């Protein structure tokens, strides 16, 4: 079976640079390769067919080159709506087959998260469970650590977090962390703190509430 | 002069529309006609229709029928001869029958005052109640004495009084009124000496053996008309033949003085728009099995090598107007087609059937019908194919897709989503225009080994061979170009599948060596081809068995030898010069030499001491 | 304008079958095949099969025994059926059409159908506000939102002030809780002391269960 190996898993580039994506087929394959762009929540979009053949409607800063095993999708001056996953496909062996994708990410200056902590709403409690929410707004890069201290015992296996895809305008990220505890677990402790570590915060920031 | 020739007719007693219509076509056929190749049939002609064009008719090959006419005169005044190569009924070469109608009127005057020979056959006269004079005619002069016994002469005039024969007439015999209608006797009136016809009553006015109606002199070229053939007004037993055994060349050779045969005539070239058969006779057009072509401003029939060229509309046009594919209904109309003018589409509908166009499922077996196809003018489109069939077997003889029309203006060959393993297109040596697309054939191998650019004629043609079984996989399973193929590619696994051989080839098949020095049919080579030695060379043990094609290029003759040629037998009874048949015997060394001129039937040795009696 | 549009119930019980219709416009199925490709987080974009123009199909080996694609040319409609789904089979299913006859360079795609394979029941979300913590001053930056919790299956939509509030809005990817229900947050950055706008309403819609819910967000 034909393997298609895309790389890197995440490509990180400054906006305006010439960026190039690579797809390696495990058997030499002529020019029987196509490329797609897929934007969050979108269906894929054809960019190049047969390795180098432009598709109409696609902006000219997209090119492709390659023949045999080694193919390359390229972008001169990367824009901010070039933020997507890029896929290769092969055309030579039954069945057609896709690569796993490269994610294109725009580099940007470090932007510290604005941190916010939210006690569980009215009612939710008296309806059984409490959800506690930390929010880190508009940061870059994506690497962020969030630890929950409850009276200062570090917490584990009681939180889930979620990160937005990269914003096309400010090109940043937004995380949110949710502490889940049934009523009376909340209503046993007092202090509920949220502790963020991130490149753009000289020492960790902490946000708490309720004493 | 060069006699005008008409076809003749064989409608017998049938009547082509109105009396009016009938006569018009009678006139159309015979107007101006001198020699009738077929029969003369004069039929259903009514009172007061001018039949005078018949005065031109000199000769009839077939029979003469005159029946159901009420016309008064039938002026066949120059008819000299009826050969009777065919008979009307039973064995009459002349039949004059019921020339009358209900209205108490019929035929009066049949003045055939120049009818001297009926070459074969008898004569019937019956129910001509208005006929005159003919009853006095003395047939023993006209009819051969073998046919007298089947003669049927019943003369009964009940509708008029007739004119009388001139006293000038012999034995009161005449064709009608006047000295000019007296019988001219040319047989029964001649001395013992003469074999056949005459023009006087003396020994020195016999006609040459060769004449039919009579003559103007002694010699073979004074005939009125010829018993057998005529060759520029010389009467002969046969037309001089096209080939004579050449004593010098030791075989058949174009007879320079030779001639084609046309009717009762020997001729150097056939009349306009006639073809010469492989026997030297002028015919109107070629027998199936054979075809028209030309050497020296002469159209001839040669026999077809494989199936005869036959052209058929593609799907879309003609019988196949409004058809989506070759299918159970239409496929029969493809039998024997050799060239398709248009496109072939073989589509899934063909195999499911289609209740909408009332077509049953196609029996895939029936695709064998396409095997005769060598040429597609447009495009070949195959979107379905029986799954248990390894390649495109029905197109193994396809030589060229011209791609004049193309699918969607693009493809001249499209093969899509089949179960095949090889293309099988081993005869395809040209795709004139259009693009190839071979897609989604998950078991398909071999396709890449071909250099498609060599089949192409136009430099912009593209190939798209996509999503088939991979190069990798095929190679990994041995499904790869046979060893005996050159680096020029495959249409499949087999040695007859290669574009070209690395060594040599028999027919379509690739091989490592010819059968020089060992083998069934011993062979020689030329342009990497193994060509068989003529079957009359002996297989040799030590060296080669021949140097070329002829019976001249044997090392050693398997049987007998005739000049430089090895033959199976010595020439025995072949036609030669001066119409002297030719006979040879084989001596001690099994070498042919001429027999004594005198051995009418061949010989076993030299001289009269070689053909005992 | 080539267009493909999918309809089909996307939540599917295990061993039950998935059916999707693909209505097609701007070309005919007479001339073009329609392919089917699915996508998941884990095992990538994967080709499933084709109904080619002439009506014959072809299925990738792993779905040979359980794929069924049909069509009705005159209504330009394609009909994907797959039997006996398991959780392997959760994905976004797509129809596609190649740019070019008989090829696989897929220039055109339906909007995809989000197909979820679980035996669980459908449930509407409950909605709690994440009220803004009282600061004192500033002018520019204060955060607040909504917790959209305990619903199944995906998706849910969130608009603010009935769509009349765009920038600042971050609606996080849902997260599958240990209860098997999904949960979410939809957050917005705001001018502190709510300068300009007072009303912050939360417009949560869950189509699978058909539950519209609105919550208001202030310090109650
Ligand atoms: C497998 O292979 C086999 C073998 O190749 C294939 O078999 C062929 O298949 C063809 C496709 O089916 C088929 O051709 C079809 O023939 C149809 C019927 O033909 C006859 O009728 C003709 C017209 O009838 C009426 O209409 C005329 C005008 O409207 C009128 O002039 C007639 O007098 C008659 O009058 C009546 O009309 C009205 C109601 O009918 C009414 O208003 C009026 O008062 C009258 O009552 C007729 O013209 C025709 O004659 C032709 O051929 C003969 C010789 O055979 C020749 O002498 C004549 O000169 C003449 O050329 C015949 O008698 C016909 O209806 C089909 O087609 C349509 O043409 C256009 C374009 O394609 C189409 O848009 C029209 O209509 C509807 O048709 C579709 C359904 O078919 C609908 O979906 C559309 O909505 C559309 O509007 C026309 O009808 C077509 O021509 C052929 O005969 C088959 N051949 C053989 C050998 O069997 C097979 O198909 C293959 N299968 C597969 C899967 O591959
Ligand atoms: C294809 O050719 C064959 C002969 O080569 C035709 O079949 C013959 O038809 C004649 C009458 O025309 C018969 O006397 C023979 O017995 C037939 N031979 C067979 C059936 O083997 C045949 O008609 C041709 N096909 C078409 C439809 O043109
Ligand atoms: C489709 O074609 C394939 C490939 O030729 C057929 O499968 C092969 O069948 C032979 C026996 O006839 C086996 O020995 C091979 O092993 C098969 N190849 C494999 C492993 O795929 C297949 O039968 C054809 N399809 C149908 C339905 O006839
Ligand atoms: C070869 O041609 C000659 C033509 O001259 C034929 O004629 C010869 O024999 C006849 C005997 O019946 C005579 O009638 C001719 O006078 C005589 N001609 C000559 C040569 O003077 C001859 O028959 C032909 N040969 C054969 C085999 O018949
Ligand atoms: C292909 O299948 C047919 C139909 O069942 C069968 O008769 C035939 O033997 C098979 N293979 C061939 C043509 O050799
Ligand atoms: C072809 O056969 C010859 C015999 O002369 C042999 O020597 C040569 O190596 C062969 N090459 C092939 C496989 O075509
Ligand atoms: C074959 O036979 C001839 C005899 O005529 C001889 O001269 C020659 O040497 C032989 N050829 C070969 C190739 O051995
Ligand atoms: C033959 O007679 C016809 C009557 O059909 C007459 O029209 C024609 O001129 C004659 N043919 C010639 C060219 O003499
Ligand atoms: C998915 O699960 C089923 C049922 O246990 C199994 O048969 C199948 O092979 C699995 N396939 C995958 C990993 O997609």
């Amino acid at each position: 079976d034909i393997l298609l190996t895309q790389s890197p898993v995440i490509l990180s580039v400054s906006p305006g640079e010439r960026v190039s994506f690579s797809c390696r087929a495990s058997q030499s394959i002529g020019t029987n390769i196509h490329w797609y762009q897929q934007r969050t929540n979108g269906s894929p979009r054809l960019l190049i067919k047969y390795a180098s053949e432009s598709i109409s409607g696609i902006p000219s800063r997209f090119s492709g080159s390659g023949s045999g095993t080694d193919f390359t999708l390229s972008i001169n001056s990367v824009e901010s709506e070039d933020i997507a996953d890029y896929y290769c496909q092969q055309n030579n062996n039954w069945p057609t087959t896709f690569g796993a994708g490269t994610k294109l990410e725009l580099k940007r200056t470090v932007a510290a998260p604005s941190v916010f902590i939210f006690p569980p709403s009215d009612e939710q409690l008296k309806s059984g469970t409490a959800s506690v929410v930390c929010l880190l707004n508009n940061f870059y890069p994506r690497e962020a650590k969030v630890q929950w201290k409850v009276d200062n015992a570090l917490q584990s296996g009681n939180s889930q977090e979620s990160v937005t895809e990269q914003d096309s305008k400010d090109s940043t990220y937004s995380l949110s962390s949710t502490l889940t505890l049934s009523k009376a677990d909340y209503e046993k402790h007092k202090v509920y703190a949220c502790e963020v570590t991130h490149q753009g915060l000289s020492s960790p920031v902490t946000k708490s509430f309720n004493r | 002069e060069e006699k005008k020739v008409c076809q003749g007719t064989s409608n017998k007693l049938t009547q082509l529309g109105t009396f009016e219509d009938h006569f018009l076509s009678l006139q159309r056929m015979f107007n101006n006609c001198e020699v009738v190749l077929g029969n003369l049939e004069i039929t259903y002609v009514q009172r007061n229709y001018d039949l005078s064009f018949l005065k031109t008719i000199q000769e009839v090959a077939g029979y003469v029928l005159i029946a159901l006419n009420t016309v008064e005169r039938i002026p066949l005044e120059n008819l000299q001869i009826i050969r009777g190569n065919m008979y009307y009924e039973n064995s009459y070469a002349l039949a004059v029958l019921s020339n009358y109608d209900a209205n108490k009127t019929g035929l009066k005057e049949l003045p055939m005052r120049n009818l001297q020979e009926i070459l074969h056959g008898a004569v019937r006269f019956s129910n001509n109640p208005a006929l005159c004079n003919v009853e006095s005619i003395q047939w023993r002069d006209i009819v051969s004495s073998d046919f007298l016994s089947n003669m049927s002469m019943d003369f009964q005039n009940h509708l008029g009084s007739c004119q009388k024969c001139d006293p000038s007439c012999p034995n009161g015999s005449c064709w009608g009124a006047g000295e000019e209608n007296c019988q001219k006797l040319t047989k029964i009136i001649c001395a013992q000496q003469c074999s056949g016809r005459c023009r006087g009553k003396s020994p020195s006015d016999c006609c040459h053996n060769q004449c039919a109606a009579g003559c103007t002199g002694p010699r073979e070229s004074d005939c009125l008309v010829c018993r057998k053939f005529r060759d520029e007004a010389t009467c002969k037993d046969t037309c001089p033949p096209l080939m004579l055994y050449n004593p010098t060349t030791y075989q058949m050779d174009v007879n320079p003085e030779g001639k084609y045969s046309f009717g009762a005539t020997c001729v150097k070239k056939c009349p306009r728009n006639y073809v010469v058969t492989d026997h030297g006779s002028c015919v109107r057009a070629c027998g199936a099995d054979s075809y028209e072509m030309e050497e020296d401003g002469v159209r001839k029939c040669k026999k077809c090598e494989g199936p005869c060229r036959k052209v058929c509309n593609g799907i879309g046009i003609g019988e196949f107007k409004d058809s989506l594919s070759i299918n159970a209904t239409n496929i029969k109309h493809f039998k024997n087609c050799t060239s398709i003018s248009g496109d072939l589409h073989i589509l899934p509908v063909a195999f499911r059937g289609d209740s909408f166009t009332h077509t049953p499922p196609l029996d895939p077996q029936e695709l064998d019908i396409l095997k005769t196809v060598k040429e597609i003018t447009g495009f070949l489109l195959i979107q379905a194919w029986p799954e248990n069939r390894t390649d495109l077997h029905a197109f193994e003889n396809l030589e060229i897709i011209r791609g004049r029309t193309k699918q969607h203006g693009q493809f001249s060959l499209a093969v899509v989503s089949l179960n095949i393993t090889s293309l099988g297109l081993r005869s395809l040596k040209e795709i004139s225009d259009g693009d190839v697309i071979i897609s989604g054939n998950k078991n398909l191998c071999y396709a890449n080994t071909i250099n498609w650019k060599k089949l192409f004629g136009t430099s912009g043609q593209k190939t798209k061979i996509i999503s088939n079984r991979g190069e990798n996989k095929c190679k990994a399973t041995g499904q790869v170009c046979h060893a005996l193929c050159s680096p020029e590619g495959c249409w499949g696994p087999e040695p007859r599948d290669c574009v070209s051989c690395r060594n040599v080839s028999r027919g379509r098949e690739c091989v490592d060596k010819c059968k020089l020095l060992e083998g069934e049919p011993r062979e020689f080579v030329e342009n990497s081809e193994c060509i068989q030695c003529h079957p009359e060379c002996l297989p040799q043990a030590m060296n080669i068995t021949c140097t070329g094609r002829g019976p001249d290029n044997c090392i050693q003759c398997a049987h007998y030898i005739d000049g430089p040629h090895c033959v199976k037998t010595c020439p025995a009874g072949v036609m030669g010069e001066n119409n002297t048949l030719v006979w040879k015997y084989a001596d001690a060394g099994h070498v042919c030499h001429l027999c004594h001129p005198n051995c009418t039937y061949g010989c076993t040795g030299p001289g009269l001491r070689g053909c005992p009696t | 304008q080539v267009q493909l549009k999918q309809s089909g119930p996307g939540l599917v019980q295990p061993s039950q079958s998935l059916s999707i219709t693909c209505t097609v416009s701007g070309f005919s199925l007479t001339n073009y095949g329609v392919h089917w490709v699915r996508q998941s987080p884990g095992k990538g974009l994967e080709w499933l099969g084709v109904i080619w123009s002439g009506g014959n199909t072809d299925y990738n080996t792993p779905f040979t025994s359980r794929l069924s694609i049909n069509k009705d040319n005159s209504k330009s409609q394609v009909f994907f059926k797959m039997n006996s789904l398991q959780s392997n089979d959760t994905a976004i299913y797509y129809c596609a059409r190649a740019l070019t006859y008989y090829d696989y360079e897929f220039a055109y795609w339906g909007q995809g159908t989000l197909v979820t394979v679980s035996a669980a029941s459908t449930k509407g979300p409950s909605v709690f506000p994440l009220a803004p913590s009282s600061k004192s001053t500033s002018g520019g930056t204060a955060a607040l939102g909504c917790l959209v919790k305990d619903y199944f299956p995906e998706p849910v939509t969130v608009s603010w002030n009935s769509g009349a509030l765009t920038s600042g809005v971050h609606t996080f990817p849902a997260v599958l809780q240990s209860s098997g229900l999904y949960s979410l947050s939809s957050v917005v950055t705001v001018p502190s002391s709510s300068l300009g706008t007072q009303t912050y309403i939360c417009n949560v819609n869950h189509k699978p269960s058909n539950t519209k819910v609105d919550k208001r967000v202030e310090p109650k």
Side-chain angles (χ1 to χ4, degrees), chain A residues 1 26-28 32 49-50 90-96, chain B residues 440-442 448 464-473:
Chain A
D1 275 350
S26 59
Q27 307 164 23
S28 97
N32 299 320
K49 45 93 125 309
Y50 301 95
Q90 69 70 46
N91 214 17
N92 191 283
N93 295 3
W94 190 93
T96 61
Chain B
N441 305 290
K442 68 157 143 284
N448 304 279
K464 262 196 215 188
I465 297 161
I466 63 188
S467 169
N468 304 302
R469 174 157 279 213
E471 284 266 295
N472 203 247
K473 197 61 215 132

Side-chain angles (χ1 to χ4, degrees), chain B residues 347-349 352 383-384 417, chain C residues 29-34 50-59 69-73 78 102:
Chain B
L347 316 171
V349 257
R352 308 174 305 244
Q383 275 181 10
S417 184
Chain C
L29 305 163
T30 269
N31 307 308
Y32 284 100
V34 169
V50 251
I51 184 148
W52 294 112
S53 62
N56 49 312
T57 71
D58 190 14
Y59 307 139
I69 302 158
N70 286 298
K71 75 181 189 170
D72 174 329
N73 288 301
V78 181
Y102 313 129

